Structure formats: C-alpha cells, structure tokens
Design a protein around this ligand. Structure first.
Ligand SMILES: Nc1ncnc2c1ncn2[C@@H]1O[C@H](COP(=O)(O)OP(=O)(O)O)[C@@H](O)[C@H]1O
Ligand SMILES: COC(=O)c1sc(-c2cccs2)cc1N
Ligand SMILES: [Cl-]
Ligand SMILES: [Cl-]
Ligand SMILES: [Cl-]
Ligand SMILES: [Mg+2]
Ligand SMILES: [Mg+2]
Length: 265
C-alpha cells in the first residue's frame, strides 16, 4: 500500500537505539506525520523482530487521547517504516532539561494524564514496561502522550530479551529477571513523579552495578523542598512488593493529585 515515494521527508525529530524519526508529509493529502525508520540488518542482528510486530500490533489497536497513534507501516529492501502521529511540542525529556524542575501543578497534571492512559492500557492487560521522559511526547495543546511500545507485552510475563541501557525506571522484579505484571508501570510512575519534582530519578548512580543495588534495596531520599503530599504518593508507588503498590484509581484520587492537577480523571 504505502511506499517511500508517497512521502516528502523533512527534518530529523529524534534518534533512538533502532529508530531514526523524521518529519514527513504525505504527497497527495499534504498530511503531516512522523516517520520512524528502522534498519533491517540492525533488527535482525539484535533479533528484535518480535518486539517490532508487538509495537505495531499493540499501538495500532489502542485508541486514547493520551496515547500516540500508529497509522500503519511499510518496508523495502533495507528498512522498516512506522507511520506515526506527529507530536509538535516534543518530548518531556527536553522540557525537563529546559526547566530543570517542574512545579507541583505541572507534575500532578502530567501524572494524571499518564495514569489515565495506563488505566486504559491495563484494561486490556497491556503493560508498557518502558515509561521514561524520552518516550513521553507532547501534543499541540501540551497534553502528554505515551509512545514507543517496543517493550510492551501482555501480562503476566517474563523477560526473554537483554536489557539494553539504563536501569533507572525499572522495578526490582524486572531487573532481577523474575516474572512480573501490571504493577511494573506503577513503579515507573513513582520514579517519574520524583524526577519531575527533583530533576533526577531517585536511584541514579555512577555505575550500572551501583544503580542495581539502590533499586533492589529501594534506597532513596527526598530533598527538603518536596512537600508532604508528594512524599506520600511517591512512597506508596515505590514499594518493593508489587502487590502493595496502589491501583491507578488510588493515584487519580490521591489528595495531592486532586489538589494540584488541572485535568480530571
Ligand atoms: N511522533 C513523534 N513526534 C515527534 N517526535 C518523535 C515522535 N516519535 C519519536 N520522536 C522522537 O524520536 C525519538 C525516538 O523515538 P522512539 O520511537 O522512542 O525510538 P526508540 O524506539 O528507538 O527509542 C524520541 O525520543 C522522540 O524524541
Ligand atoms: C529482516 O527483516 C526484518 O527484520 C523485518 S521486521 C518486519 C516487520 C516488523 C513489524 C511489521 S513488519 C519486516 C521485516 N522484513
Ligand atoms: Cl514470557
Ligand atoms: Cl521480553
Ligand atoms: Cl485502577
Ligand atoms: Mg524510545
Ligand atoms: Mg523501541
């Protein structure tokens, strides 16, 4: 159906481990979108074709205003192209580097939008497993949108793929290679809430080995400026035991969230 000849390519939007993402316009309709380019050699070398099909299958069937749309795909001799919704305001990662820290209103609003999107995903027993600032995009009205579903699966699950980069957003059960479920996304939600308010993730360290130690032992402390309500929510989400992490509705109706969020459940 679709081919490369159907698009005019624009400026690079960003780069990932496998993905090179470009702004693009469909020639006949003038529709502006994002084109995620992956190299097949690369894909075969790492043996992650199953991850890419899951990304296409899962994300194309999800429909939610806080989740990035995937319209379709095509491939040629050397590359695979994912046709994505274009997010014009960029990543949360870039916004964080710009402002150093977010205030409580901005943070609570982002968390509400995240929890809404995750609640939708978990209703289909879909777990994202890779929630972090680089994978959170921003729409034209500044609304948060979850993207990059390459690591998503159906719960329950194990891990048959090698962990690539940072451990900073993964729960103990995940880094220890144990079986896991939906509660992994709630651990990540706690890590994000901390990083939004403080400017860095709670278990950050100089080495892989040291980061692993802090996560498994849940070693983190708060700066003085972090308020009581924020500390309560974060402490509840960062529990070593997955079953003691709250449900997403508990997050959405948490007193600190309701008092500071500008968006509803
Ligand atoms: N739809 C989009 N709109 C704008 N920028 C995007 C979009 N998709 C990806 N990007 C940019 O490209 C980067 C990599 O995209 P991603 O799909 O996460 O690649 P990978 O799966 O290799 O991590 C993102 O961090 C983001 O900066
Ligand atoms: C060497 O080829 C590959 O790795 C791949 S991955 C892929 C697809 C992934 C998701 C939808 S289609 C097609 C080919 N041909
Ligand atoms: Cl498995
Ligand atoms: Cl896996
Ligand atoms: Cl819930
Ligand atoms: Mg990514
Ligand atoms: Mg990916």
């Amino acid at each position: 159906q679709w081919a490369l000849e159907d698009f005019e390519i624009g400026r690079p939007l960003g780069k990932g481990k496998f993905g090179n993402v470009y702004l693009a316009r469909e020639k006949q309709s003038k529709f502006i979108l994002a084109l995620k380019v992956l190299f097949k050699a690369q894909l075969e070398k790492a043996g992650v074709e199953h991850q890419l099909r899951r990304e296409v299958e899962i994300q194309s069937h999800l429909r939610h205003p806080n989740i990035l749309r995937l319209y379709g795909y095509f491939h040629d001799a050397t590359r695979v192209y994912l046709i994505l919704e274009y997010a014009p305001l960029g990543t949360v990662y870039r916004e964080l580097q710009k402002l150093s820290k977010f205030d409580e209103q901005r943070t609570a609003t982002y968390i509400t939008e995240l929890a809404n999107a995750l609640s939708y995903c978990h209703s289909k027993r879909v777990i994202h497993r890779d929630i972090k600032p680089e994978n959170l995009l921003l729409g034209s009205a500044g609304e948060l949108k979850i993207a990059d579903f390459g690591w998503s699966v159906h719960a329950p699950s194990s891990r048959r793929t090698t962990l690539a980069g940072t451990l900073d957003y993964l729960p103990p059960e995940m880094i220890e290679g144990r079986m896991h479920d939906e509660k992994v996304d709630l651990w990540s939600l706690g890590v994000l809430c901390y990083e939004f308010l403080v400017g860095k993730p709670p278990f950050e360290a100089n080495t892989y080995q040291e980061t692993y130690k802090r996560i498994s032992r849940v070693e983190f402390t708060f700066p003085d400026f972090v308020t009581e309500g924020a500390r309560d929510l974060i402490s509840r989400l960062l529990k070593h035991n997955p079953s003691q992490r709250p449900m997403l509705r508990e997050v959405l109706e948490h007193p600190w969230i309701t008092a500071n969020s500008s968006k509803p459940s």
